[PDB]
Amino acid sequence: RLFRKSNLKPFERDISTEIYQASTPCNVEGFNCYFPLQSYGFQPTNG
Amino acid sequence: TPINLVRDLPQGFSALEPLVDLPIGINITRFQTLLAL
């Protein structure tokens, strides 16, 4: 999870896919509001 | 409790005895009784 409305408390889980409004409100991708999750580029070539 | 009294709650005293603690956490709210018919 890269975006979240409020910091999660210790030992908290966030499986929800709530879209975040990272200043222009959204109702929704490309800019100013993204999918909360972001993927890892785990490749053997990675350092 | 031996609760039978007559009406409303009496003037007595007693205490609980905990049973189990399970790992839900996950922001628990909105408890809801399950009424029967």
Side-chain angles (χ1 to χ4, degrees), chain A:
Chain A
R1 205 168 199 86
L2 195 148
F3 285 150
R4 185 180 164 81
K5 288 188 283 189
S6 62
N7 291 337
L8 77 169
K9 312 321 188 175
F11 292 137
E12 188 172 9
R13 217 153 305 178
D14 186 355
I15 313 301
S16 66
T17 56
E18 307 299 336
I19 183 163
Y20 185 50
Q21 302 83 41
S23 62
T24 66
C26 274
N27 56 5
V28 291
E29 298 287 340
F31 170 63
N32 78 23
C33 57
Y34 292 166
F35 197 60
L37 277 296
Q38 192 276 336
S39 60
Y40 285 107
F42 291 135
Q43 298 165 355
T45 187
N46 290 14

Side-chain angles (χ1 to χ4, degrees), chain B residues 1-8 10:
Chain B
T1 54
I3 192 71
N4 297 261
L5 54 79
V6 297
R7 179 69 258 171
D8 215 326

